[PDB]
Design an enzyme around this catalytic site. Structure first.
Site, PDB file in Angstrom:
ATOM      1  CE1 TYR A  22      -3.784   2.363   0.236  1.00 30.50           C
ATOM      2  CE2 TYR A  22      -2.758   3.177   2.251  1.00 30.50           C
ATOM      3  CZ  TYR A  22      -3.713   3.296   1.257  1.00 30.50           C
ATOM      4  OH  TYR A  22      -4.596   4.344   1.294  1.00 30.50           O
ATOM      5  CG  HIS A 109       2.453   8.378   0.550  1.00 30.56           C
ATOM      6  ND1 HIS A 109       1.527   7.660   1.273  1.00 30.56           N
ATOM      7  CD2 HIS A 109       3.135   7.471  -0.196  1.00 30.56           C
ATOM      8  CE1 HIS A 109       1.639   6.376   0.978  1.00 30.56           C
ATOM      9  NE2 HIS A 109       2.607   6.237   0.087  1.00 30.56           N
ATOM     10  CG  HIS A 117       2.235  11.935   4.417  1.00 30.57           C
ATOM     11  ND1 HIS A 117       1.492  12.615   3.479  1.00 30.57           N
ATOM     12  CD2 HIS A 117       1.795  10.653   4.391  1.00 30.57           C
ATOM     13  CE1 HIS A 117       0.641  11.781   2.907  1.00 30.57           C
ATOM     14  NE2 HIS A 117       0.805  10.585   3.443  1.00 30.57           N
ATOM     15  CG  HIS A 119       3.101   6.154   5.216  1.00 33.48           C
ATOM     16  ND1 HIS A 119       2.124   5.971   6.171  1.00 33.48           N
ATOM     17  CD2 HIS A 119       2.595   7.044   4.328  1.00 33.48           C
ATOM     18  CE1 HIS A 119       1.073   6.715   5.871  1.00 33.48           C
ATOM     19  NE2 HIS A 119       1.334   7.375   4.758  1.00 33.48           N
TER      20      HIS A 119
HETATM   21 MN   LIG Z   1       0.131   8.467   3.007  1.00 38.88          MN
END
Ligand SMILES: [Mn+2]
Ligand SMILES: [Mn+2]
Ligand SMILES: [Mn+2]
EC number: 5.6.2.1
Length: 183
Positions: A22, A109, A117, A119
């Protein structure tokens, strides 16, 4: 400015493979990668040909009550260029996983465009450079004979002070990057 950072562990119905695919927009999400500006992993053991291979094993071999990974999320300074954001994120990932060579995968992202941001998922397994098959990597550690057991687990991410200490570390990193960038 303040660049908020949060964190959480994945053990309820959390799947490392699904999470990795993801955030990197891989696998099923391969037809929707515009949200991903950058992706990288590091400290992967020899049995891993692709980062996903590590998360697949974690899901297939880590015990039920085990910690598949520690997910960290932090906002990136909008003034910074993409290259500067890439260097900063990588730099901070190393800061948290570099000492004990904890395998990790991170992705940057484009939250809309006003909220970039990052992850970052960290595996709490110490890569000691000793080759181990996927089915053996997550087994219990054997202090007497390391090569006969799984990779040793780290406790460095469990302390209560870790969250704020990480936030202070992130701040010091973002701030530093900002000033040498002119800002
Ligand atoms: Mn994100
Ligand atoms: Mn550092
Ligand atoms: Mn390293």
């Amino acid at each position: 400015a303040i660049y908020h950072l949060t964190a959480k562990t994945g053990s309820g119905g959390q799947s490392a493979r699904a999470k990795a695919d993801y955030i990197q927009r891989e696998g099923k999400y391969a037809r929707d990668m515009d949200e991903v500006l950058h992706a990288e992993s590091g400290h992967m053991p020899e049995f891993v040909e692709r980062p996903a291979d590590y998360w697949d094993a974690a899901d297939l071999y880590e015990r039920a009550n085990g910690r598949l990974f520690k997910e960290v999320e932090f906002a990136l300074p909008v003034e910074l260029t993409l290259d500067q954001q890439k260097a900063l994120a990588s730099e901070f990932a190393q800061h948290l996983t570099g000492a004990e060579r904890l395998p990790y995968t991170l992705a940057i992202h484009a939250g809309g465009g006003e909220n970039p941001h990052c992850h970052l998922m960290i595996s709490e397994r110490i890569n000691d450079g000793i080759e181990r098959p996927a089915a053996q990597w997550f087994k219990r550690y054997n202090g007497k004979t390391p090569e006969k057991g799984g990779a040793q687990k780290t406790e460095a991410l469990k302390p209560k002070a870790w969250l704020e200490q990480t936030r202070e570390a992130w701040a010091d990193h973002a701030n530093r990057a900002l000033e040498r960038a002119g800002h």
